[PDB]
């Protein structure tokens, strides 16, 4: 199912159907939704971290009326929306093969750190299907247009390193250090001005469809808000005092 | 409790305050809204009112019980419809600052207002139809006038909500701000208005009300006569003097 | 041939079917549309109607010959205008599911409807003006009410079309779906409506019609009296009972 | 000086020309606009008019002095309101080609027109309220009819401007072109209209005017009678003949 | 003019004014439009392939009232729109110099394979002009913003390899294998679920201006449709049966 | 085709006589529907120019079938057919004269109000006693009466239910002619014959202008009058009408 562990500001979720390569069934989507509810509502959890159990990250949807709209509409869409909605930094530690919904889900994390031997398999087209879970939204922005089209149309593997070189993910590390480095970053982010970070993430999300003019109003808006937070005050005094800042995330 | 009243210069703030009931429009609440606005109408120290709820709800309809214990006979003689007519009769700029849900009565209360500023997560809706009823406070008249037949009919006949963004593109709302700024930005809007001549505001607003009441030609004549009214006021002099010699005008309300 | 009639629960589907003529609104077609709607008006097993064409055409105007052989004298005594008045008189939720071209009469027929769902490739237009005529079925009244003077005038005076996307942003349409889904999504829209109390739908729709007929104040009073009507119905009880005790309501139409 | 008059086939161009005064609507200017339009109304060689200003200003209000030296008594007997009524009475397609600022009277003059094409840097506004006045030339009636209550009220009660892009999304304008193309594109729009039957244009436009004057049902009947009028014209024959046998129609204006 | 050949699901068009470097004249635009009509309407043609005759791909518009709007409005705009509209995979085999309209046309293919010695010359600015044929739409998406601006403002050559490194095209091959590899891919795509591929291309096109929220509705919509195709059913049974799938493209 | 409604003809004037003596000419559903079919059929018969509607000397129409409006409940009343028959009556596009003798009560008064012109008998009565039954006027009684006799008289009759004589009704402007009972119908027919002497299209045009006066404000009414007027300017009969008048003869109209 889904293993979850909270420690030191960091909520770490583990996709846990190891033999199936943590492919999703209906029961797994429900447990994930439940865990996310906690991340959203509990404000001591100031970083989420997704990762897979066993050797794979997520092979996506377990493929065993033909209305694929409903699956999208019930499971992946609210999951994707709320993750995008979450005013908290989300890290995807891709520890192995990420296929179908698993790849597009992984690629949609704010910061993605992939093991060296991990590969992203978006073979939707081979099944006469389309990349879901924001697939067709993400690829053009994460890889640029010519490559998103190439990846989605021909539909074949992308290694961690290729993805990296291509700008699609943030970092690639030796398999055996992945769990460590990801958890390193999450612990770090979980002590950073979470509110500020949440506005940054929202602003950047929003800028994809805003003009510069609209976006300058939104930045003024977010700065105005950020500069009233406790963490702004803390951050300008810690710096002035050459001491290390203690953020609460408000 | 129920309605908080607060003040910022000639701006009056009215906060629906029934959290546990999703700010549902109580009979008591409605009456308190009516008493406050009727008091402000004649308070010369007030120029503008803002109505808001909280972040999660503006107003999520009206008390469902108060509406059930009314039968054919009790519905005919209900007090509420005149309350709504008195709210509409308020003669000063009325801005709705909507966060979260504005549904049924809540939505009809935002449509009642002159201007709606919404938050990024606002939702507008008329779910009356799902309950075996329909809008009974202007929903079926005011919506269709600002967003047109197709959308208003869909909303009224199916009862599905729309987002703050759909709402602005449709004309139901004229602003969309981050949730934490809606109220503050609504108040700034209000303070800009409240900086103008009070009588001008009242005549301009009356002009606007009447556009919904008459054909264009008569609307023009009526606008002419409210115009001419202002020509006769002291503040007209002050307003353009302060503008031509570049200062901030001080209006006497005459 | 000409008009296909089909059924999905209390939803009635009317398919304009004249492919070779681009679904042009025949006198015969118009009359068949009128007969079907007037029959559904009184069929208590029906709650909603959907009108559609095909992927390439909704309706590409009206028969151009039938309109030519009418002279000054023959135009004065034409039967068609009353047909349109009978279509408008249909008392149940009427959804137009538009794919491809809705031009002239086709477009006027979509404007007649309460709600328009369009496909991504829909086009709306009034090219009457290019033929030395003008809209004679509500084009010059209904468009301008939902999209405003500038756009409606441009469309009516130049006769240029607009895309489904321009149409939605303007308020002429309230949905835009991929072409292959428009009809299916239109029917789902219809089934949501048809799940509500039939009398409520009828009173809500009547409220809506009347908004185009009166000034706001009278509209409010009239809405009050259609409201109060429902208060007196059995389904009002059922609608809110089924809602408060969380089930699907079964309405008797009383 | 003051108003330049120019011609392109059956298209008449009217250029507000008071640069140093930001094209402010002079009493003299207004009267010249009235004389030109009333002359074109009866010139059978004209089908359409376009009004424009310059790149920086369409019209930045009206002369502020001419309005001050009018007191209660002088405002009652002012000549200007009838000038506006005569401008509105112009019976041919009237397109406003707006670049730069259209404020106060300038904006009310664009709202008067049937169709507005704006430039990417156009601004629309009613700052009457900041001067201790309000709109006295249709501002409080025409705006609200095309953009709805919330936006029109905000604009009228606060006096803040909007961009050409907000304007189009709201329905105040139906086109937005790069500044250097607005006028040229406006004229092409005009030439497309002017290619149609003149009487059809006039009857279509009259249909459109009347929609703002009556309830829908009466609007439909009135459209029917302007329709039937055209049925009786020679150009109706020409318009559809030239269309069916695929050529460019030559209309006699009968 | 324009040579055309249909074989095995693949329609291959050859820009054919070799000495002029297949620059366009009015007569050439008409023949191209005619050939495209066939691609759109004939549904056994499940891949289009554009390439040039002689040593160049396309030098663009042959430059021998000054109203450049009309040329754009008559020739290039409908050509670009309909190509974007085509629910079929289009491959551009750039076999030499691609200049002006030729470069921006080439760059607008879904999948671009360029010969090693090919260069993209967008020198519009040198003529006091702007990049047309979707030039100013494409460059920011294919190369990202700083590079689109740099390319369009300074207006000088871009080699196949540079373009590649930059993410603007999919592949670069030795000149002598170009014709072969392109035609290899087209034959391949012409046997793939064409309907699915057409939705993928549309989705990715649309995502450029959609929000994530809008785009998730469109993906649900396209999945719902894709999952009713014959090829979906075929693809899930071929895979389950460890056999090679026979798509028809419906 | 209905024993209860005698259809008769005089030139271009059609006569419809309500004929349910036993039932005081009460408006049946069937009678109402018959009436609608007659006038609709007449609407398109180019040999007809005017209609006259009458009862007998004792009744014009004394209300409606009381049973038919009782067996209708809130639900049955919402979906009733009758209201659309009333709107189809009013849509009759040709001049319609009510010749009223004796009682025109309830639906009977409403019927007469529905007509363009009322000529009455000396002994005729007009009233809306719906309020006494615990209902109200259901076919225009509340709308058409006040428009022609003012708020005081209209509210009185509607709220109290009392009758007014033919003479009171002429003074109040509900009726525009009062004759001896034995002459009412005859004189009403002479009035239609005089109307029927004019251009069919002109009659239709002028009537339409009159109907719209009750539907739009004054300015819009004028604009509307002008487009109708212009319409006639395009007709052949306009030439015949003034030609036969200037050269002093009886005009022969072709309906065009």
């Amino acid at each position: 199912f889904i293993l979850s562990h909270v420690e030191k500001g960091v909520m770490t979720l583990t996709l846990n159907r190891p033999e199936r390569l943590n492919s999703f069934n209906d029961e797994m989507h429900a447990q994930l939704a439940e865990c996310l509810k906690q991340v959203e509502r509990d404000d001591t959890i100031r970083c989420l971290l997704l990762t897979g159990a066993g050797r794979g990250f997520c092979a996506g949807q377990d493929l065993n009326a033909p209305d694929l709209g409903m699956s999208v509409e019930r499971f992946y869409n609210p999951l994707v929306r709320r993750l995008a909605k979450l005013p908290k930094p989300v890290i995807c530690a891709v520890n192995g093969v990420a296929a179908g919904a698993g790849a597009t889900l992984a690629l949609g994390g704010d910061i993605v750190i992939a093991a060296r031997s991990a590969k992203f398999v978006m073979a939707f087209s081979k099944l006469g299907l389309i990349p879901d879970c924001g697939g067709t939204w993400l690829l053009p922005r994460v890889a640029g247009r010519a490559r998103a089209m190439g990846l989605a149309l021909l539909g074949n593997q992308l290694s961690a390193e290729q993805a990296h070189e291509w700008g699609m993910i943030w970092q690639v590390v030796d398999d055996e250090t992945l769990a460590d480095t990801a958890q390193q970053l999450a612990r770090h982010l979980a002590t950073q001005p979470t509110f500020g970070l949440g506005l940054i993430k929202q602003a950047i999300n929003s800028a994809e469809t805003n003009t510069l003019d609209t976006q300058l109003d939104l930045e003024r808006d977010y700065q105005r808000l950020a500069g009233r937070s406790a963490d702004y005050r803390e951050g300008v005094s810690a710096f002035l005092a050459k001491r290390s800042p203690q953020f609460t995330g408000k | 409790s129920e309605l908080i009243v607060s003040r910022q210069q000639r701006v009056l703030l009215l906060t629906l305050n029934r959290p546990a009931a999703r700010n549902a429009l109580n009979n008591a609440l409605l009456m308190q809204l009516v008493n406050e606005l009727e008091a402000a109408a004649t308070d010369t120290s007030i120029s503008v009112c803002v109505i808001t709820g909280n972040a999660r709800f503006f107003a999520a309809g009206a008390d469902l019980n108060e509406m059930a214990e009314k039968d054919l006979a009790a519905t005919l003689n209900d007090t509420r419809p005149q309350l709504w007519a008195r709210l509409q009769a308020f003669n000063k700029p009325l801005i709705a600052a909507v966060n979260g849900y504005a549904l049924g009565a809540g939505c009809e209360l935002a449509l009642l207002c002159d201007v709606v500023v919404a938050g990024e997560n606002a939702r507008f809706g008329l779910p009356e139809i799902t309950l075996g009823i329909m809008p009974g406070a202007g929903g079926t008249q005011r919506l269709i006038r600002s967003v047109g037949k197709s959308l208003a009919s869909k909303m009224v006949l199916s009862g599905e909500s729309i987002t703050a963004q759909q709402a602005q593109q449709a004309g139901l709302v004229s602003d969309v701000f981050p949730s934490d700024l809606t109220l503050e930005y609504a108040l700034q809007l209000a303070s800009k208005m409240a900086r103008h001549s009070p009588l001008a505001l009242q005549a301009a607003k009356q002009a606007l009300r009447q556009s919904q009441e008459v054909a264009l030609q008569a609307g023009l004549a009526q606008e002419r006569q409210l115009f001419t009214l202002l020509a006769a006021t002291e503040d007209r002099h002050e307003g353009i003097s302060a503008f031509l010699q570049k200062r901030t005008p001080d209006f006497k309300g005459r």
Side-chain angles (χ1 to χ4, degrees), chain B residues 219-245:
Chain B
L220 294 175
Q222 178 130 292
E223 172 194 271
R224 287 312 299 181
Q225 60 212 34
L226 287 151
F227 183 80
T228 298
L229 181 69
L230 298 180
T233 63
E234 304 284 332
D235 291 327
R236 180 178 183 267
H237 180 283
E238 180 64 13
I240 64 155
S241 154
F243 171 90
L244 188 144
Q245 62 187 296

mmCIF file of all heavy atoms in Angstrom, chain B residues 219-246, unseen atoms left out:
data_model
loop_
_atom_site.group_PDB
_atom_site.id
_atom_site.type_symbol
_atom_site.label_atom_id
_atom_site.label_comp_id
_atom_site.label_asym_id
_atom_site.label_seq_id
_atom_site.Cartn_x
_atom_site.Cartn_y
_atom_site.Cartn_z
ATOM 1 N N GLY B 219 -33.275 55.956 -19.671
ATOM 2 C CA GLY B 219 -32.106 55.901 -18.817
ATOM 3 C C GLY B 219 -31.246 57.141 -19.026
ATOM 4 O O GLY B 219 -30.756 57.730 -18.062
ATOM 5 N N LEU B 220 -31.054 57.522 -20.290
ATOM 6 C CA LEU B 220 -30.291 58.713 -20.649
ATOM 7 C C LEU B 220 -30.903 59.981 -20.065
ATOM 8 O O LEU B 220 -30.182 60.836 -19.543
ATOM 9 C CB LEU B 220 -30.201 58.845 -22.171
ATOM 10 C CG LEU B 220 -29.404 57.743 -22.848
ATOM 11 C CD1 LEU B 220 -29.456 57.876 -24.354
ATOM 12 C CD2 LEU B 220 -27.989 57.863 -22.371
ATOM 13 N N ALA B 221 -32.226 60.120 -20.165
ATOM 14 C CA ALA B 221 -32.894 61.324 -19.653
ATOM 15 C C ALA B 221 -32.722 61.435 -18.121
ATOM 16 O O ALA B 221 -32.441 62.504 -17.561
ATOM 17 C CB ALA B 221 -34.375 61.301 -20.044
ATOM 18 N N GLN B 222 -32.887 60.299 -17.460
ATOM 19 C CA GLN B 222 -32.796 60.177 -16.016
ATOM 20 C C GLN B 222 -31.373 60.473 -15.549
ATOM 21 O O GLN B 222 -31.161 61.063 -14.485
ATOM 22 C CB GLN B 222 -33.197 58.744 -15.648
ATOM 23 C CG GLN B 222 -33.140 58.374 -14.187
ATOM 24 C CD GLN B 222 -34.439 57.717 -13.707
ATOM 25 O OE1 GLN B 222 -35.468 58.358 -13.643
ATOM 26 N NE2 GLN B 222 -34.390 56.438 -13.396
ATOM 27 N N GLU B 223 -30.398 60.055 -16.350
ATOM 28 C CA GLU B 223 -28.989 60.330 -16.068
ATOM 29 C C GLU B 223 -28.731 61.829 -16.214
ATOM 30 O O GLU B 223 -28.107 62.460 -15.373
ATOM 31 C CB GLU B 223 -28.100 59.567 -17.045
ATOM 32 C CG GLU B 223 -26.631 59.937 -16.960
ATOM 33 C CD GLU B 223 -25.821 59.422 -18.141
ATOM 34 O OE1 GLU B 223 -25.318 58.281 -18.067
ATOM 35 O OE2 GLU B 223 -25.690 60.167 -19.135
ATOM 36 N N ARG B 224 -29.234 62.403 -17.292
ATOM 37 C CA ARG B 224 -29.248 63.847 -17.410
ATOM 38 C C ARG B 224 -29.801 64.547 -16.161
ATOM 39 O O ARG B 224 -29.146 65.451 -15.642
ATOM 40 C CB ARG B 224 -29.940 64.283 -18.712
ATOM 41 C CG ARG B 224 -29.047 64.003 -19.944
ATOM 42 C CD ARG B 224 -27.635 64.520 -19.676
ATOM 43 N NE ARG B 224 -27.672 65.966 -19.445
ATOM 44 C CZ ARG B 224 -26.615 66.740 -19.206
ATOM 45 N NH1 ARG B 224 -25.392 66.221 -19.150
ATOM 46 N NH2 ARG B 224 -26.784 68.046 -19.020
ATOM 47 N N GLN B 225 -30.943 64.110 -15.631
ATOM 48 C CA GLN B 225 -31.499 64.824 -14.464
ATOM 49 C C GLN B 225 -30.749 64.608 -13.151
ATOM 50 O O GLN B 225 -30.700 65.522 -12.327
ATOM 51 C CB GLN B 225 -33.028 64.675 -14.289
ATOM 52 C CG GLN B 225 -33.557 63.272 -14.099
ATOM 53 C CD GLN B 225 -34.958 63.090 -14.685
ATOM 54 O OE1 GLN B 225 -35.311 63.689 -15.712
ATOM 55 N NE2 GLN B 225 -35.757 62.251 -14.036
ATOM 56 N N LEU B 226 -30.130 63.438 -12.967
ATOM 57 C CA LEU B 226 -29.207 63.244 -11.825
ATOM 58 C C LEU B 226 -27.897 64.019 -12.057
ATOM 59 O O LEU B 226 -27.308 64.565 -11.128
ATOM 60 C CB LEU B 226 -28.938 61.762 -11.571
ATOM 61 C CG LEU B 226 -30.069 60.914 -10.942
ATOM 62 C CD1 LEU B 226 -29.981 59.464 -11.369
ATOM 63 C CD2 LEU B 226 -30.135 60.990 -9.412
ATOM 64 N N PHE B 227 -27.457 64.096 -13.307
ATOM 65 C CA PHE B 227 -26.331 64.943 -13.643
ATOM 66 C C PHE B 227 -26.591 66.374 -13.207
ATOM 67 O O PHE B 227 -25.781 66.998 -12.515
ATOM 68 C CB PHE B 227 -26.086 64.946 -15.162
ATOM 69 C CG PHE B 227 -24.892 65.753 -15.570
ATOM 70 C CD1 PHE B 227 -23.597 65.218 -15.460
ATOM 71 C CD2 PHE B 227 -25.033 67.061 -16.023
ATOM 72 C CE1 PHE B 227 -22.474 65.968 -15.814
ATOM 73 C CE2 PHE B 227 -23.874 67.822 -16.404
ATOM 74 C CZ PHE B 227 -22.610 67.261 -16.287
ATOM 75 N N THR B 228 -27.722 66.896 -13.662
ATOM 76 C CA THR B 228 -28.046 68.299 -13.489
ATOM 77 C C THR B 228 -28.166 68.623 -11.998
ATOM 78 O O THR B 228 -27.761 69.697 -11.541
ATOM 79 C CB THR B 228 -29.326 68.654 -14.265
ATOM 80 O OG1 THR B 228 -29.103 68.430 -15.665
ATOM 81 C CG2 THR B 228 -29.710 70.110 -14.029
ATOM 82 N N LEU B 229 -28.697 67.666 -11.247
ATOM 83 C CA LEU B 229 -28.724 67.738 -9.794
ATOM 84 C C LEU B 229 -27.342 68.091 -9.222
ATOM 85 O O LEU B 229 -27.212 69.058 -8.460
ATOM 86 C CB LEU B 229 -29.214 66.402 -9.242
ATOM 87 C CG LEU B 229 -29.356 66.236 -7.735
ATOM 88 C CD1 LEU B 229 -30.497 67.089 -7.224
ATOM 89 C CD2 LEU B 229 -29.588 64.773 -7.417
ATOM 90 N N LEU B 230 -26.317 67.315 -9.594
ATOM 91 C CA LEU B 230 -24.950 67.560 -9.135
ATOM 92 C C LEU B 230 -24.434 68.939 -9.525
ATOM 93 O O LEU B 230 -23.737 69.592 -8.746
ATOM 94 C CB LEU B 230 -23.993 66.502 -9.686
ATOM 95 C CG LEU B 230 -24.269 65.066 -9.260
ATOM 96 C CD1 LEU B 230 -23.230 64.151 -9.896
ATOM 97 C CD2 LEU B 230 -24.242 64.968 -7.740
ATOM 98 N N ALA B 231 -24.757 69.371 -10.741
ATOM 99 C CA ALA B 231 -24.347 70.696 -11.197
ATOM 100 C C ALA B 231 -24.672 71.719 -10.130
ATOM 101 O O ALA B 231 -23.936 72.687 -9.947
ATOM 102 C CB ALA B 231 -25.027 71.054 -12.503
ATOM 103 N N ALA B 232 -25.776 71.478 -9.421
ATOM 104 C CA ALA B 232 -26.291 72.403 -8.408
ATOM 105 C C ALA B 232 -25.644 72.268 -7.018
ATOM 106 O O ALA B 232 -25.950 73.048 -6.110
ATOM 107 C CB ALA B 232 -27.809 72.265 -8.291
ATOM 108 N N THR B 233 -24.758 71.287 -6.853
ATOM 109 C CA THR B 233 -24.132 71.039 -5.553
ATOM 110 C C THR B 233 -22.817 71.811 -5.326
ATOM 111 O O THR B 233 -22.127 72.205 -6.269
ATOM 112 C CB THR B 233 -23.907 69.524 -5.298
ATOM 113 O OG1 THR B 233 -22.996 68.988 -6.270
ATOM 114 C CG2 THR B 233 -25.229 68.767 -5.345
ATOM 115 N N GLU B 234 -22.486 72.007 -4.054
ATOM 116 C CA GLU B 234 -21.294 72.728 -3.644
ATOM 117 C C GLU B 234 -20.032 71.913 -3.947
ATOM 118 O O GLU B 234 -19.000 72.461 -4.367
ATOM 119 C CB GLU B 234 -21.364 73.027 -2.140
ATOM 120 C CG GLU B 234 -22.599 73.804 -1.669
ATOM 121 C CD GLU B 234 -22.535 75.285 -1.996
ATOM 122 O OE1 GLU B 234 -21.415 75.835 -2.085
ATOM 123 O OE2 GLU B 234 -23.610 75.900 -2.159
ATOM 124 N N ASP B 235 -20.121 70.604 -3.724
ATOM 125 C CA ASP B 235 -18.973 69.720 -3.895
ATOM 126 C C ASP B 235 -18.543 69.603 -5.356
ATOM 127 O O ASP B 235 -17.388 69.355 -5.640
ATOM 128 C CB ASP B 235 -19.253 68.339 -3.300
ATOM 129 C CG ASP B 235 -19.341 68.365 -1.778
ATOM 130 O OD1 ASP B 235 -18.625 69.182 -1.159
ATOM 131 O OD2 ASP B 235 -20.124 67.574 -1.202
ATOM 132 N N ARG B 236 -19.467 69.790 -6.290
ATOM 133 C CA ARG B 236 -19.092 69.813 -7.698
ATOM 134 C C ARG B 236 -18.031 70.880 -7.900
ATOM 135 O O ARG B 236 -17.004 70.639 -8.544
ATOM 136 C CB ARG B 236 -20.305 70.115 -8.570
ATOM 137 C CG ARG B 236 -20.012 70.165 -10.045
ATOM 138 C CD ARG B 236 -21.311 70.415 -10.792
ATOM 139 N NE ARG B 236 -21.169 70.409 -12.242
ATOM 140 C CZ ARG B 236 -20.956 71.494 -12.978
ATOM 141 N NH1 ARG B 236 -20.864 72.684 -12.401
ATOM 142 N NH2 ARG B 236 -20.830 71.387 -14.296
ATOM 143 N N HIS B 237 -18.289 72.061 -7.337
ATOM 144 C CA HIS B 237 -17.317 73.148 -7.314
ATOM 145 C C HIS B 237 -15.996 72.693 -6.680
ATOM 146 O O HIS B 237 -14.921 72.883 -7.254
ATOM 147 C CB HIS B 237 -17.876 74.350 -6.546
ATOM 148 C CG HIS B 237 -16.948 75.513 -6.484
ATOM 149 N ND1 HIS B 237 -15.849 75.561 -5.631
ATOM 150 C CD2 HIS B 237 -16.926 76.687 -7.162
ATOM 151 C CE1 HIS B 237 -15.215 76.697 -5.799
ATOM 152 N NE2 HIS B 237 -15.842 77.405 -6.721
ATOM 153 N N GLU B 238 -16.088 72.096 -5.493
ATOM 154 C CA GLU B 238 -14.910 71.658 -4.744
ATOM 155 C C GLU B 238 -14.128 70.570 -5.481
ATOM 156 O O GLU B 238 -12.907 70.643 -5.598
ATOM 157 C CB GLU B 238 -15.305 71.172 -3.343
ATOM 158 C CG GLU B 238 -14.124 70.704 -2.483
ATOM 159 C CD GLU B 238 -13.143 71.825 -2.164
ATOM 160 O OE1 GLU B 238 -13.489 73.005 -2.387
ATOM 161 O OE2 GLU B 238 -12.029 71.530 -1.686
ATOM 162 N N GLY B 239 -14.847 69.569 -5.975
ATOM 163 C CA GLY B 239 -14.254 68.469 -6.705
ATOM 164 C C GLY B 239 -13.366 68.878 -7.869
ATOM 165 O O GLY B 239 -12.291 68.306 -8.044
ATOM 166 N N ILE B 240 -13.807 69.850 -8.672
ATOM 167 C CA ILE B 240 -13.043 70.265 -9.857
ATOM 168 C C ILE B 240 -12.042 71.385 -9.567
ATOM 169 O O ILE B 240 -11.084 71.586 -10.325
ATOM 170 C CB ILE B 240 -13.945 70.717 -11.031
ATOM 171 C CG1 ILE B 240 -14.740 71.961 -10.644
ATOM 172 C CG2 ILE B 240 -14.864 69.591 -11.472
ATOM 173 C CD1 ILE B 240 -15.155 72.796 -11.828
ATOM 174 N N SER B 241 -12.283 72.123 -8.486
ATOM 175 C CA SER B 241 -11.335 73.121 -8.007
ATOM 176 C C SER B 241 -10.109 72.401 -7.477
ATOM 177 O O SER B 241 -8.979 72.678 -7.878
ATOM 178 C CB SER B 241 -11.955 73.946 -6.881
ATOM 179 O OG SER B 241 -10.949 74.474 -6.037
ATOM 180 N N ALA B 242 -10.358 71.462 -6.571
ATOM 181 C CA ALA B 242 -9.312 70.649 -5.987
ATOM 182 C C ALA B 242 -8.561 69.875 -7.063
ATOM 183 O O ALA B 242 -7.404 69.513 -6.872
ATOM 184 C CB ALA B 242 -9.904 69.700 -4.962
ATOM 185 N N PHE B 243 -9.217 69.630 -8.196
ATOM 186 C CA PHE B 243 -8.591 68.909 -9.304
ATOM 187 C C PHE B 243 -7.770 69.827 -10.203
ATOM 188 O O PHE B 243 -6.685 69.456 -10.650
ATOM 189 C CB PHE B 243 -9.638 68.173 -10.143
ATOM 190 C CG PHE B 243 -9.095 67.591 -11.429
ATOM 191 C CD1 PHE B 243 -8.582 66.299 -11.467
ATOM 192 C CD2 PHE B 243 -9.102 68.334 -12.602
ATOM 193 C CE1 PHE B 243 -8.080 65.760 -12.655
ATOM 194 C CE2 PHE B 243 -8.604 67.805 -13.788
ATOM 195 C CZ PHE B 243 -8.092 66.516 -13.814
ATOM 196 N N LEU B 244 -8.294 71.019 -10.471
ATOM 197 C CA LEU B 244 -7.613 71.966 -11.351
ATOM 198 C C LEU B 244 -6.415 72.634 -10.662
ATOM 199 O O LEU B 244 -5.383 72.884 -11.291
ATOM 200 C CB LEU B 244 -8.596 73.004 -11.907
ATOM 201 C CG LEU B 244 -8.057 73.951 -12.986
ATOM 202 C CD1 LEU B 244 -9.109 74.275 -14.037
ATOM 203 C CD2 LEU B 244 -7.492 75.227 -12.367
ATOM 204 N N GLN B 245 -6.552 72.911 -9.368
ATOM 205 C CA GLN B 245 -5.433 73.424 -8.578
ATOM 206 C C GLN B 245 -4.755 72.315 -7.773
ATOM 207 O O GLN B 245 -4.094 72.577 -6.767
ATOM 208 C CB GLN B 245 -5.868 74.591 -7.687
ATOM 209 C CG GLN B 245 -6.929 74.258 -6.652
ATOM 210 C CD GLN B 245 -7.431 75.491 -5.926
ATOM 211 O OE1 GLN B 245 -6.683 76.152 -5.213
ATOM 212 N NE2 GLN B 245 -8.700 75.814 -6.116
ATOM 213 N N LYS B 246 -4.954 71.076 -8.223
ATOM 214 C CA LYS B 246 -4.141 69.913 -7.818
ATOM 215 C C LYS B 246 -3.978 69.655 -6.315
ATOM 216 O O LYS B 246 -2.867 69.713 -5.792
ATOM 217 C CB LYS B 246 -2.762 69.980 -8.480
#
